[PDB]
RNA sequence: ACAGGCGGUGGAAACUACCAAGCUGGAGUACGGUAGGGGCAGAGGGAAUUUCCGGUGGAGCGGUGAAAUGCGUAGAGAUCGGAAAGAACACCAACGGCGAAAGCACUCUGCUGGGCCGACACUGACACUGAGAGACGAAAGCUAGGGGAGCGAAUGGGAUUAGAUACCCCAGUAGUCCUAGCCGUAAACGAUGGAUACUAGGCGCUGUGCGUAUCGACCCGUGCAGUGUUGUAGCUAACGCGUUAAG
């Protein structure tokens, strides 16, 4: 598949969502928790890049994926 | 091959007491040696080979 | 990070090991820097090639002295200078490579040109 | 034979009693097939082995309460595809049943050695 | 010499290589064979004295015969330290050793006991083992030749200390920066030794005139 | 006067910065392969020890530098047979693997994280570090609820000693274990912060490719990412570091 910016966020959005349901049961899996914050951080720096390059794509991507916008 | 159901291959890497021999005398590789451990430890639970003697 | 900070070192380490070739990276800035060392007599020859779309340059060092080097203006602290404070390394045995509005030149060439600039690295 | 994307390859080797008759193991092998195939499964096979004596004695208690000491037993071997979420019923049945003595469900894979 | 023995120093003077064994370059050395024979031929005309340092068992006698053709000197056995640097002690042992050969001529051995004559015998025998090819030196040489760098590591350093040019064993075993004159390819066999040794000893003969 | 500071004004556009387009080497995604005690959860297994049940049998057993306490004719210890429980996994095992560390080793299975390599899908500098903050975090210890075989602070007893609130010996509580949570400290050490470029080599250990080759694997020859040991330059007060730097 492609490697566009919005596509990487879509895969992380599923990779993140897939692990939340896992931690509801295996909450003591702290090694996976260290991996969960990576994908949460990788998308943070990509969306941080998408923001200052084009705000139109930002408002459209966050709207369909139901993403919380950051203050400041 | 190397697996639990093979007696001839696993029986030549055990001691007279049924213990696991070292990699040096067996002259195996890493991928090989780790499987001889698993194949034996599996078989002992199945009673295909005694834990001791 | 700072490319030129790496350029000055790849030439330094080559003299400590006492080698002839460097295989230094090629850019718009380095081609001007190396061009000064040819005319000034610090390097015997330079030569260009490529392996990919990128480019490189191959230098030819000389065979108890040592090829001293030093960087001055860093990214964390940029250093500029006016005409009256142009340095004079060792009374003339050294030189300073500095960037003017009319490209990069030697400090001596700036003494005649009458225009200071950003000192980047001293040589002796 | 390849596997579909929805499941991978498992196998199972069991240890049955020696005193069982012919008619018993027919119903037993038929019990696990209809139980294993009731869930998501494909390409079930059944090999057979003899009464090779065990390396160490065994203790097993039936529902009646009594125990029995054994030295030989009938071994069976399965090679099949099942879903990942349909193996814990199999392992659960291989412990509650009294005809089965031991159970070892392994997941053999490809290794180049 | 091998994949586990090649020094990265000789990399400018390596052409190719083979199954395990190493292949030396004969091109660059040929210039140095000319520079060596030109310097040795020119030096011999002025009347200098030279020295050869050979103690390898395979070329112990070859270096001995090599010195008889010219008026140079050889070192057949080990270096025993301070031969050239501690020359003041060497003159004492040579002045000593020179006298003992005159001591044996006299009839004083008769009036010495049995054991005392044995000590003087074994004393002179020990000096002959190490001070053979130096009996007619009478001073310090101006150029010193090294046949082996590894076994005679000590001899190469006193030359660097006293500041004397020298020839070395620039084959892959050693460091080429120790000698100004460079002649590789001498660890192969006597063929590599005699082909070079006789060639350099030959040039000394016509230089002597 | 010079030097230097502030403001205005006319020019130069390399560099820092700004603005408009470009590339892929850094980074990341999609794929296709691959090793491992990565982590969590649930099942399975044997010996050994301890206690009880009995059989056999009859005087010591056990311990120490020497002895005693202690156990024992109310039948000990030893010896076969049997019930049960708890905790921990010899051999494999290292010049070994994984993990950010702390740490992870009897077996499988489930869910799940990270790394390496290949290449012809793609992205187009989306990078590094990180004050505050947040998370994880050996043992010990605490708050409830369970469990407790063995070992063992404390506390007793028997000895050694001038003394022995110790070292030794016999018994032994908390705790050591499980599930919830607190505590957030260690020589938590590689006594060495992280990222990046460059800088001689020798030995051999993995993981994954390439090519030769017996193309059955192997072996041999090399690339990449790691992991250990010697060592050149260089550094270092010295010891020593030394391509995984303390250059
Ligand atoms: Mg820049
Ligand atoms: Mg411009
Ligand atoms: Mg902080
Ligand atoms: Mg604890
Ligand atoms: Mg601390
Ligand atoms: Mg630790
Ligand atoms: Mg510290
Ligand atoms: Mg640290
Ligand atoms: Mg070292």
CA B20 to chain D, closest CA, distance in angstroms equals: 16
CB atoms within 10 A of CB E54: 25
The answer to whether residue D113 neighbours chain B at the CB level (below 8 Å) is yes
Listed residue (E8, B20, E25) closest to B12, CA to CA: B20
φ, ψ for residue D31, nearest 5 deg: -70, -40
Q: What tokens appear for B52 in the block?
A: 């001791």
Q: Looking at the partner chain, which of D13, D108, D113 has a beta carbon nearest the beta carbon of B46? A: D13
Cβ-contact E182, E29 below 8 angstroms: yes
User: In this structure, are residues E76 and E135 in contact, taking their beta carbons and an 8 Å threshold?
Assistant: no
User: Nearest nucleotide, C1' to the C-alpha of A2?
Assistant: F122
Interface contact flag, B45 D102, Cβ < 8 Å: yes
CA distance E172 to E49: 30
**Among the listed residues C33, C94, C31, C87, the one whose alpha carbon sits nearest the alpha carbon of residue C67:** C94
Cα A27 to averaged position of ligand 4 atoms, centre (Å): 21
Please, do chains A and B touch (3+ CB pairs < 8 Å)?
no
State both tokens at E16: 């190719």
Q: Does the beta-carbon distance from B48 to D55 stay under 8 Å?
A: yes
Interatomic CA distance for residues C86 and C116, integer angstroms:
7
Q: How far apart are CA E41 and CA E82, in angstroms?
A: 29
CA of C101 to the centre of ligand 2 (A): 10
- Give the pairing of strands C118-123 and C69-71: antiparallel
Q: Which of B3, B46, B51 lies nearest to residue D102, judging by beta carbons? A: B46
- Contact criterion met (CB below 8 Å) for C44 and C21: no
CA dihedral B2, B5, B8, B14 (to 10 degrees): 80
Contact B50 D56 (CB under 8 A): yes
Separation of CA D37 from chain center: 14
Q: What are phi and psi of D94, to 5 degrees?
A: -75, 0
Q: Please report which helix (H) or strand (E) contains residue E15, including its range.
A: strand E14-17
Which among B31, B42, B47 is the nearest to D55, CB-wise? B47
Closest chain B residue to D16 measured between Cα atoms? Answer: B46
CB C34 within 8 A of CB C23: no
Mutation pick from D47, D49, D55, D100 vs chain B, by most beta carbons of B within 10 Å, is D55
Q: Is E59 helix (H, G, I), strand (E, B) or coil?
A: helix
User: Quick one: residue C114, left, alpha or beta (phi over 0 = left, psi -120 to 50 = alpha)?
Assistant: left
Residue nearest to nucleotide F38 (CA to C1'): A31
User: Residue A50: enclosing H or E segment and its boundaries?
Assistant: helix A30-53
- How many other CB atoms are there within 10 angstroms of residue E1's CB atom? 15
CA angle (C22, C28, C29) in 5-degree steps: 70
Contact B5 D77 (CB under 8 A): yes
Residue labelled with tokens 């011999």: E44
Report how far residue B36's alpha carbon sits from residue B1's, in angstroms, rounded to the nearest whole number: 11
Q: Are E144 and E155 in contact (CB under 8 A)?
A: yes
Instruction: Find the nucleotide nearest A31 (Cα to C1′).
Output: F39
- Per-residue burial over E184-199, b if 16 or more Cβ lie within 10 Å, else e, is bbbbeeeebbeebbee
Chains D and A are in contact, defined as 3 or more C-beta pairs closer than 8 angstroms = no
Burial class (CB in 10 A: 0-12, 13-18, 19+), C26: middle
Whether the Cβ atoms of residue A34 and residue A21 lie closer than 8 Å to each other:
no
* Helix and strand counts by DSSP (H, E) for chain D: 2, 6
- Positions on chain F within 7 A of a protein C-beta: 3-4, 11-16, 23-25, 28-31, 34-47, 82-83, 90-94, 96, 99-101, 106-114, 121-128, 135-137, 180, 195-203, 205-208, 217, 221-222, 233-234, 247
| Interface with D, mutate which of B6, B45, B46 (most D CBs under 10 A) | B46
Q: What are the beta bridge partners of residue C8?
A: none
Domains and CATH numbers, chain C: 1-66 (3.30.1370.30), 67-124 (3.30.1490.10)
**Could you tell me the distance in Å between the CA of residue E7 and the C1' of nucleotide F211?**
27
- Separation CA C59–CA C57 (nearest Å): 7
Burial annotation C51-86 (CB, 10 A radius, 16+ → b, else e): eeeeeebebebeeeeeeebebbbeeeeeeebeeeeb
CA–CA distance, E181 with E156 (Å, rounded to integer): 13
DSSP 8-state secondary structure symbol assigned to residue E168: -
Between CA E186 and C1' F221 the distance (Å) reads 29
Closest partner residue to D113 (CB to CB) among B32, B48, B50 is B32
Contacts of B31 (CB under 8 A, 6+ apart): D111, D112, D113
What's the gap between Cα E17 and its chain centre? 30
* Distance, CA of A29 to C1' of F177, in Å: 21
Distance CA E34, CA E28 (A): 10
In sequence order, the 6+-apart residues with CB closer than 8 A to the CB of E149 are E156, E168, E169, E173, E174, E178
Of B2, B5, B50, which has the smallest distance from its Cβ to D55's Cβ? B50
Question: Which has the closest alpha carbon to E195: E41, E29, E11, E21?
Answer: E29
- Rounded CA-CA distance D17/D76 in Å is 11
Nearest one of A6, A14, A18, A21 to A62, comparing CA atoms? A6
Q: Residue C15: what are its φ and ψ, rounded to 5°?
A: -80, -30
| Contact predicate E101/E174, CB 8 Å | no
Partner D contacted by B26 (CB < 8 A):
no
Which residue shows structure tokens 């054994």? D70
Short-list B11, B16, B1, B2, CA closest to B48: B11
Task: Say yes or no: B34 contacts chain D, CB-CB below 8 A.
Answer: no
For every residue of C45-79, which 3-state class applies, written as one string?
Answer: EEEEECCCCCCEEEEECCCCCCCCEEECCCCCCCC
Contact predicate E155/E167, CB 8 Å? no
- Asked if residues E204 and E72 have their Cβ atoms less than 8 Å apart, the reply is yes
Q: In terms of Cα–Cα distance, which of E147, E168, E166, E136 is closest to E55?
A: E147
d(Cα C87, Cα C66) in Å, to the nearest integer? 21
Interchain contact B45–D (C-beta under 8 A): yes
Q: How far is CA A34 from CA A10, A16, A17, in A?
A: 20, 12, 15
Nearest to E174 by CA among E27, E10, E4: E10
> Measured between alpha carbons, how far is C26 from D6 in angstroms, rounded to an integer?
53
Tell me, in angstroms, the distance from the centre of ligand 8 to residue A38's CA.
Answer: 22
> How far, in Å, CA of B11 to CA of C70, rounded?
70
Token duo for residue C39: 């005319």
| A12: nt with nearest C1' to CA | F29
Neighbours of chain D (3+ CB pairs under 8 A): B
3-state DSSP helix/strand/coil % of chain E, to nearest 5: 50, 10, 40
Across the interface, whether the CB atoms of D77 and B35 are under 8 A apart is answered no
D50: left (phi over 0), alpha (psi -120 to 50) or beta: beta
Within 41-70 of D, beta carbons closer than 8 Å to B belong to 52, 54-56, 58
CA distance D99 to D28: 9
CA distances from A20 to A16, A41, C20 (A): 6, 15, 58
Q: Nominal resolution in Å? A: 3.0
């Amino acid at each position: 598949n492609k490697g566009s910016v919005e596509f990487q966020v879509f895969c992380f959005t599923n990779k993140i969502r897939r692990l939340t349901l896992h931690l509801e049961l295996h909450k003591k899996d702290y090694s996976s928790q260290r991996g969960l914050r990576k994908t949460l951080g990788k998308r943070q720096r990509l969306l941080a890049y998408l923001l200052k390059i084009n705000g139109v794509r930002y408002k459209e991507l966050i709207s369909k994926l139901n993403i919380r916008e950051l203050k400041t | 091959r190397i697996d639990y159901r093979n007696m001839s291959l696993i029986s030549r890497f055990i001691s007279e007491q049924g213990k696991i021999l070292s990699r040096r005398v067996n002259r195996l590789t890493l991928k090989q040696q780790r499987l001889i451990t698993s194949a034996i430890k599996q078989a002992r639970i199945l009673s295909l080979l005694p834990f001791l003697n | 990070k700072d490319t030129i900070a790496d350029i000055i070192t790849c030439i330094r380490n080559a003299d400590m090991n006492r080698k002839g070739t460097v295989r230094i990276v090629s850019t718009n800035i380095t081609e001007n820097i190396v061009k000064i060392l040819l005319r000034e007599g610090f390097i015997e020859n330079a030569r260009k090639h490529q392996e990919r779309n990128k480019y490189f340059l191959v230098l030819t060092l000389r065979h108890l002295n040592t090829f001293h080097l030093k960087r001055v203006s860093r990214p964390g602290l940029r250093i500029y200078s006016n005409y009256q404070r142009i340095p004079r390394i060792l009374g003339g045995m050294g030189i300073a490579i500095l960037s003017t509005s009319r490209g990069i030149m030697t400090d001596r060439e700036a003494r005649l040109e009458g225009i200071g600039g950003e000192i980047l690295c001293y040589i002796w | 034979p390849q596997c579909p994307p929805g499941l991978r390859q498992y196998e199972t080797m069991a240890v049955l009693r020696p005193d069982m008759t012919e008619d018993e193991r027919l119903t037993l092998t038929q019990k696990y097939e209809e139980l294993l195939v009731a869930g998501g499964a494909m390409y079930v096979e059944v090999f057979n082995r003899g009464v090779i004596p065990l390396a160490y004695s065994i203790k097993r208690k039936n529902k009646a309460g009594e125990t029995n000491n054994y030295l030989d037993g009938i071994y069976l071997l399965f090679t099949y595809f099942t879903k990942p979420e349909s193996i814990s019923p199999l392992e659960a049945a291989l412990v509650t049943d009294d005809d089965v003595i031991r159970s070892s469900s392994f997941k053999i894979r490809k290794r180049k050695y | 010499h091998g994949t586990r023995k090649w020094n990265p120093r000789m990399s400018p003077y390596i052409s190719a290589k083979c199954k395990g064994i190493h292949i030396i370059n004969l091109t660059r050395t040929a210039r140095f064979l000319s520079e060596a024979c030109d310097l040795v031929f020119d030096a011999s005309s002025r009347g200098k004295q030279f020295l050869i340092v050979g103690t390898k068992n395979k070329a112990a006698d070859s270096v001995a015969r090599a010195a008889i053709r010219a008026r140079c000197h050889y070192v057949n056995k080990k270096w025993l330290g301070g031969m050239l640097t501690n020359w003041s002690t060497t003159e004492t042992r040579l002045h000593k050793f020179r006298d003992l050969r005159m001591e044996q001529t006299a009839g004083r051995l008769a009036r010495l006991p049995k054991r005392d004559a044995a000590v003087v015998k074994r004393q002179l025998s020990h000096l002959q083992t190490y001070l053979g090819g130096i009996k007619y030196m009478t001073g310090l040489p101006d150029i010193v030749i090294i046949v082996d760098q590894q076994e005679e590591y000590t001899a190469l350093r006193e030359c660097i200390t006293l500041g004397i040019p020298t020839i070395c064993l620039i084959d892959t075993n050693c460091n080429p920066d120790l000698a100004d004159i460079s002649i590789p390819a001498n660890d192969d066999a006597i063929a590599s030794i005699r082909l070079i040794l006789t060639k350099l000893v030959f040039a000394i003969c016509e230089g002597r005139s």
